[PDB]
Design a binder for this molecule. Sequence first.
Ligand SMILES: [Zn+2]
Length: 492
Amino acid sequence: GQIIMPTPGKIERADGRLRLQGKIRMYAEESPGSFIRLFYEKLVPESAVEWCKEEVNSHISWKKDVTLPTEGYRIRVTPERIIVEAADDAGFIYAIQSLRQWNTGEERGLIFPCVEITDFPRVKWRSFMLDSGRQYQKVSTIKKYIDMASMLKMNYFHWHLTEGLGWRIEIKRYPFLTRIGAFVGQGPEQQGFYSQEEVKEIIGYAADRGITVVPEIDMPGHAEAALNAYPRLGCFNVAVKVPQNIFCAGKDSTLIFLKNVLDEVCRMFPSAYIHLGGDPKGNWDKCPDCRSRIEKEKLKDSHDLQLWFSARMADYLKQKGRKAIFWGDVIYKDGYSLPDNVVIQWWNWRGHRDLALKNAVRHNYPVICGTNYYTYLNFPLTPWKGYTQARTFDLEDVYLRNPSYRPREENPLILGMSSALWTDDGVTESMIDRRVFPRILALAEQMWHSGNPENFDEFYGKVLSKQLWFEQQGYSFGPALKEDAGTNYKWD
Ligand SMILES: [Zn+2]
């Protein structure tokens, strides 16, 4: 119709349009099972689809083109038919997302202006993270943001499931982690967890729309809720206040406990990547078990202990065939060397600029670019509670000055970009969209669109032109420019 966001790599308009109303005949070269549920949900109900044996009689065909890049697709709309080609199922899903936006919506059914679109992602890692540790969001809300990620052609949903204020991932072997740990928070929407059944539902929902769900199980820090469940995981069988105390690396029982947890996490989450956090040595510096461990392993200090600990967990993931992601803090200082399945998520630009990026390259660790400036969508456009002027930014900042956007080819160690919505300071479900939109559109554009010229005025014009369509999909917009926010914008 008008435009597709994020911007496709190549769009060539042709004369005419194709109207599809009534029973729609379709042909697929291979079993369409993996992408077809999304098509039925977003474009044409299964009741209106007739599957054809002969392609020539179909209105839409779904064909493999092995010459396309991974996740790439081609769409040709002619006055007679649509031919959709992809190298893999991800490509078909992204083609479907483009068809959703290409439909004019002028009438009932579908109307597609004739076109050839050829499209593929700039970077291999394109993620959105939601903080479900500090706040609980209902399952339908988790689905909403997975659906958003797919809509914007991302491929990973990073699910931050454990925090001092909430352990929300059910572990059958240790029932107290959720039965106690998911109810330690006392504020609005801070109670609840995701059962293994709900996780199975979420994984299936995500798979239907090309999203891999990357769980984050934080260790050794952010353990307060877990320690409420199992105080013996700490240095001593002692009680622990939950802040509106970390896992003891010195106890083999703690490592064994955490390995048992990862056993279940790996059964539930087929993701090749598991995030272990790794970002407070108060308890360690005095623990007989942590100081003993430093001795036995020939470590330097408390920090080196955290590296050793991170190394043991990553090695465990390695023998399970998974990669381990850690926040970049881990490698600010050299020390005990991390195994070759480690990935680094670079985040603290404001405090440390590109330190983590630089140390990750020195050590040959792949990197995800997720810097707070300007991928942390929890930073409002104007000050709010714990966010002062220093932790605010707008659509111009993210589009024009994002340290995480690096369009120059570069080291293949750089995997891509992340975006995040942390729920610090009581961000309830009703408060999420006004932070996420429209700035996530600039992040999605940087992740997907080729590094071709597109100035802010053109990009912002597209945002405004597509806004009501995005709202009709259920996504409310917050202010785009600092000026839009005025003097007393309501962030709560
Ligand atoms: Zn300890």
